[PDB]
């Protein structure tokens, strides 16, 4: 696989809705006298307080606090939680602070389920090193998108409870390259933030190159729970205090905990921070990028910085007792120790630049390649003289040309402009060289893991030894890094972090080279699927080691301007651009023709401000020293000449300002698009008008618009012709240029609306290659379609890029073009590339549909469902009365349709339901299409036992982490395949698909939910299938299916107890009761609510008739009782008795362990197990039962044995058939054709869900539900499970 995944809108910089929740449970061992504590919780600037507790050292609150944000993930993690015991706070007095505990959101989120539970917050006096410990405050925390103190601390691993105060020195020396503010001078000062404490240097007025040589001194507890420092170059404008740039120092990459690791240190070395545009806009909408809230769009400033964390002894009297952020003159160092100053030379070559927006391509456009302070001559820098060349940094303004209505292209063609920059940077190439080595190893690890996952999920053989070879290559790469990075250990201009961090990666990857060989033995033929997920734990640490805090050279920016106004940008990091003689030290984007996509600056690159590509460039880049420009043209496309400028005429080492091209290979691209599927709904009808517009270099071609479908089959090859590819064959065969496929809805105005985008790489054939298998012809395989943030479709294509031949286009294999003469210029996908189509009969069970939401404050009385698959389709019977009978009057009605032979290439079968209005205007009220037909392909083949079962499920929990009845430790539909044995369930949709800014949510699209079954088989059909359709052609495969007809059904619910219910009251002990909604019937136990109970025991039994299957929709709920207003809601759950009732699993009544009619084991099913087995025999078309003696039975070709006799409550021996009958119920899977499993009498663990707090647990409930139809013999009297 070489197909790219270049997403224009990644997760970085995306803001999401977030919630922080805190319960302040209690406090104990508080140090002091007569304190009356008010616990204060501050997250950011939002501060809340508890209630009043009077004169205690051990208070109890159990109070709740909720805060909500909508910020980017890195913005959240710097925010500080400030739980504090504050003695005697009121509105006029800031109370006397006992102690506090500063600890950020990122440490919460680093916990595996993002929570801390019942843990004691280690409060300490934050403004005194010598003050004692200030007790512990038991609390719990949660961030969502035993009671001993030492066993339950609120700390991560490694942190001692007796934390040591340490001075967190940061040193601010000098800065360079500052932009304009005043009209246009600058007045800088640097402000540092850490754990709410701030410290700023003195302002040096009127200097682009300041030199403070000052430092900011914090005082905080080692190890720091606040995890980043906000270092921010700032301008001291007196009216508007505005920032220039911001870099975050990450504490984990500069440290390793323990004596085996090292204390944190950094620098003194340069730091490259970014922000808004290079010019000073009078109003700057990218001011948030100056604040570091997102990705920086242009380089703002660079700043030498240091870090000198030193641990103090808390009992030392000579130290300063205050923890304030003092301002102190630092100790300056020479700039030679930061790196020997060297000259660097950038090279760039613009080959192609297409896909320019039509709204901006009216005028001649200019590029601008910049690296840091150098290469920005057009903007008029505040640069001094040479610390020289004119620094040609712009392509000439060239008139664009039209590709289509959407996009332009640039007529570079034979002339490719080039840009070369002189720059001066400190030589710190090893920080990016080791990053390149370990990034190459991590890229190989990514490719191996993705190949193993893709090849595992396609079930191609031999996976685990391939994974073992991947980890063997990983071990070889570990040894390669062990040998490579040691070659310049004795460098003199080297910081302490460059020693200790390097030692850390040496130790880690030395261990990793043997952990790979250990997990090589751990990976087997059956454990490969989960050890593959275990393998990327290595990849997490390797990606973490790959990035480094010490910057040397800032990132290379490529810009766009017309009228010298910036419209589009890109930012490639410079670490992949250095040239090195070591292949692992060589950057990934260096000396290679790299595809790169521009995007809009700031917040307007996301969402509805633009979805179109700003530009697509085949940019060549190179970076290195000015003495290393020896062979920097080795990766360029050959067959070219160089045109140079006046400053470097005749010099062999001088780079050209432009190239003129002598080789123009004619290339024809056969773009085979056959199908798209699961697309976005851009039209108001819940469907779209999709067509594929494919871009390749300077031209574009369009397939014809298909109408009113989300799974189009265009079946349309487009032949791009007479295009020009430059260079030789070795730059195209193993790495062709990219293909961008864009999907659009042909709307009512004529102008199309955006639908998505996918990328591709064609299989390349030169004229000397034979068009022979296994390479040619190219097979169809999928391409994931993205519409920016979210996935919005899947496309099927088999692109091949072919040379236009030495004699003509006829040297290519002959095009199997338009045999259908009406197609004309539209031309089909040829045979061999299209799949073989074999006829499959599709059989639909039109069972019914429930749970329609009341759109337009009513319900549709006459719905009818049409199924459409690959053009062909069938329709059900029209509903004559929906509320009386929500079930179609149709048997298994089928249609025969040509389908793809390969099962992975099956199209999504569409299901839609319409209201049958006048004139055949079939207005859609629901539509669901997402299914894979391989699933539907058919080929012929009381307390006394309860507490014992409680001990049993404790054993089941302890074995999972390492009489009687069954206990399921998860939800009942998890064990029993959701009772979807043949009565399948699908979920309908309506409206436009939910874009994050233009559309609704996906829950708002939910309108109905279909019940039915699908059976797919070939029309050349097998022999047992010929028997099955033989008994009834009106049912097909569906023989012996029970009737649809409605019935009154008794609903019998036993509820045992509830556990760990979330209280709404601030005391922490709710007042719950059981509330049951069944169909349209309300039953509440509010008169018998169990007050003041976290784990109440109900023991109530409820019998209530329902109009099944219309009333087969039940919720079992718990309600915190409240007389005033309404009772607070805890949570509900979905039951849906319909899939229980008609299942073969016998969900009507559970079966006990052994047959007994006395005491706590009395057979509660009114129909005895012998009659149960006879019923399952006639319903399962299997002969039986055939009892001999009461201890044995023959059912089909199988024999079951067991006991024979039972005593009643009178103690008299009654021999019945029921014992071996119930034993056969517990061996009912032995039947070779109809065998299955039966539901036993059980108890169940039920998650409760509240839409007030979605996606998280509200408590558990234990219960089990039986039900009985009212034409069978009458149910037994309601049993009682009242507690002891």
Author numbering: 251 to 395, 411 to 448, 464 to 667, 695 to 1248, 1323 to 1343, 1401 to 1722
From the paper:
Otoferlin is a Ca2+-sensitive multi-C2 domain protein and belongs to the ancient family of ferlins involved in Ca2+-dependent membrane fusion processes. Thought to be a core component of the SV-tethering and SV-fusion machinery, otoferlin is anchored through a single C-terminal transmembrane helix, cycles with SVs, and hence, it is found on both SVs and the plasma membrane of IHCs. Otoferlin comprises at least seven C2 domains (C2A-C2G), of which four (C2C, C2D, C2F, and C2G) are thought to bind Ca2+, involving aspartate residues in their top loops and likely also phospholipids in target membrane. Our structural work used a truncated construct lacking the nonessential N-terminal C2A domain and the C-terminal transmembrane domain of otoferlin (residues 216 to 1931).
(G) C2F-C2B interface areas in the three resolved otoferlin states. An additional layer of complexity arises from the ability of otoferlin to toggle between discrete states in a Ca2+-dependent manner as it engages lipid membranes. Consequently, the selection of the closed state of otoferlin—where C2B, C2F, and C2G are engaged in stable tertiary interfaces—is likely achieved through a membrane binding mechanism from an ensemble of sampled conformations in the lipid-free state.
